[PDB]
């Protein structure tokens, strides 16, 4: 007579978990390097950058969900302190492999067809719903095979599994002091149909591109010993002693 409704996969996986986080600078980028974010960042939307949602979504082989992207923008100041600004941010949704902008004020941000969302810091966080956009009927979470017809393709990375790019910029111009604008993206998968459950991953992750494994140096969660050791098979660790 116990309710089993909390272990539903629609309830199990629909936690709005952190999927992206960049503290990028917000200043005069006339003298900054090429690798640094010049008031914008692209992010290829993947479930794999943070290991807690990843291990939950890697419990299944095939997932059919609607990503409910919630973008939490928060701001800090890089000697003296002044008031935090009410910065307007654009988060333009670019598809996989399409043209992502190269500047803050480039003419790709006009969003003549791309889905953008113009939100502020002092507003509630920008929550959009990105649909099930796989060309297949489910996201191949694990894709045993290769994408390209040649033999140079990446193993495990099906581009149909890839959601897309989330190009996020600050709509405001540069201001005479530098701010550190941290953009946290929270994806809540919903309308979830889950197929083919898998062994939960025990060893720690190495990369987001694959399923490489190293393990800890000692038990628990080591390669030769996943479960932590005890004395003998007839030795009870948490034994009651009275």
């Amino acid at each position: 007579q116990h309710g089993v409704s909390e272990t539903l996969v629609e309830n199990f996986l629909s936690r709005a978990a952190l999927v992206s986080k960049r503290s990028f600078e917000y200043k005069d980028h006339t003298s900054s390097t090429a690798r640094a974010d010049k008031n914008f960042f692209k992010w290829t939307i993947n479930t794999r950058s943070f290991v807690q949602l990843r291990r939950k979504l890697e419990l299944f082989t095939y997932l059919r969900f609607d990503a409910e992207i919630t973008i939490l923008t928060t701001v800090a100041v890089n000697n003296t302190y002044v008031g935090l600004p009410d910065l307007t941010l654009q988060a333009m949704f670019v598809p996989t492999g399409a043209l992502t902008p190269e500047k803050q004020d480039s003419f790709h941000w006009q969003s003549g067809s791309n889905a953008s969302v113009f939100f502020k810091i002092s507003d509630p966080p920008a929550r959009i719903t990105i649909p099930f956009m796989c060309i297949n009927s489910a996201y191949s979470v694990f894709y045993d095979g290769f994408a390209g017809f040649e033999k140079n393709g990446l193993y495990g990375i099906n581009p149909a599994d890839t959601i897309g790019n989330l190009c996020v910029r600050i709509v405001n111009e540069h201001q005479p002091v530098g701010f550190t604008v941290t953009v946290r993206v929270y994806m809540k998968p919903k309308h979830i149909k889950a197929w083919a459950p898998r062994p939960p991953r025990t060893l720690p992750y190495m990369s987001i591109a694959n399923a490489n494994y190293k393990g800890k140096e000692r038990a628990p969660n080591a390669l030769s010993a996943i479960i932590g050791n005890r004395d003998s098979v007839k030795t009870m660790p948490h034994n009651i002693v009275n």
Binding site: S5, L8, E10, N11, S14, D66, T129, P131, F132, K188, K190, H191, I192
Partner: peptide, 18 residues
């Protein structure tokens, strides 16, 4: 929760009815 004032069927809440 039955509030879905959007024209898209995927935009609804998480269908936790089972």
């Amino acid at each position: 929760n039955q509030i879905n004032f959007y024209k898209d069927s995927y935009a609804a809440s998480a269908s936790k009815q089972d």
